[PDB]
Amino acid sequence: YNRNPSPGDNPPLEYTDPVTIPAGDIADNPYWKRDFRRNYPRPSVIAQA
């Protein structure tokens, strides 16, 4: 039962690398709606004035 089979005999072809529909689709996702790195918040600064 334990570590049986080894990972070396796990069939390569069985595993699937997934995509999620919004971000991995071909037809209804412009990248610029999902570019949250470039919509980063700025630091909001308030001085004594």
Partner 1 sequence: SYPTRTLANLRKIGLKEYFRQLLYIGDTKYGELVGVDKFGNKFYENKEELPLRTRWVDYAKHDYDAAHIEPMWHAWISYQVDTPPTREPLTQIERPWAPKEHVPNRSFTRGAYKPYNTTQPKIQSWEPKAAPR
Partner 2 sequence: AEPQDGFQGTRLIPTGADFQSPPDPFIDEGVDEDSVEGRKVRHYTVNFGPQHPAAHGVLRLILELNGEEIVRADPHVGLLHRGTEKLCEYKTYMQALPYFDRLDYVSMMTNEQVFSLAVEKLLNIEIPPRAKFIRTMFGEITRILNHLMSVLSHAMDVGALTPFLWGFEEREKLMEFYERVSGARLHAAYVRPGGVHQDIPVGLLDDIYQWATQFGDRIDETEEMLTDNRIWINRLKGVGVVSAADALNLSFTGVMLRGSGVPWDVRKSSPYDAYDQVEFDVPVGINGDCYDRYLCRMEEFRQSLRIIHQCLNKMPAGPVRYEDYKITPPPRAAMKENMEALIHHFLLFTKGYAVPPGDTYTAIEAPKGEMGVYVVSDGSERPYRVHIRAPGFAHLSGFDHITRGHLLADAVAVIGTMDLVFGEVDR
Partner 3 sequence: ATPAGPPPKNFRLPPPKNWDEESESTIDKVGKYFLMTEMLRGMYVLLEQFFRPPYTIYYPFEKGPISPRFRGEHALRRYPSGEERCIACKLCEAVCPAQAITIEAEERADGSRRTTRYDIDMTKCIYCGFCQESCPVDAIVESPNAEYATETREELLYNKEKLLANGDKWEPELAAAIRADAPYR
Nearer to partner 2, 44 or 48 (CB): 44
Q: Which of 10, 28, 30, 45 binds partner 2 (CB under 8 A)?
A: 10
Token representation of residue 29: 């996702």
Find all residues with CB under 8 Å of 29, minimum gap 6, and list them: 22, 23
43 contact, one of partner 2, partner 3, partner 1, none, CB 5-8 Å limit per kind:
partner 2
Report if residue 2 touches partner 2, rule: CB under 8 A.
yes
Q: 8-26: string of b/e by CB count within 10 Å (b at 16+)?
A: eeeeeeeeeeeeeeeeeee
Footprint of partner 1 (CB under 8 A): 2-3, 5-9
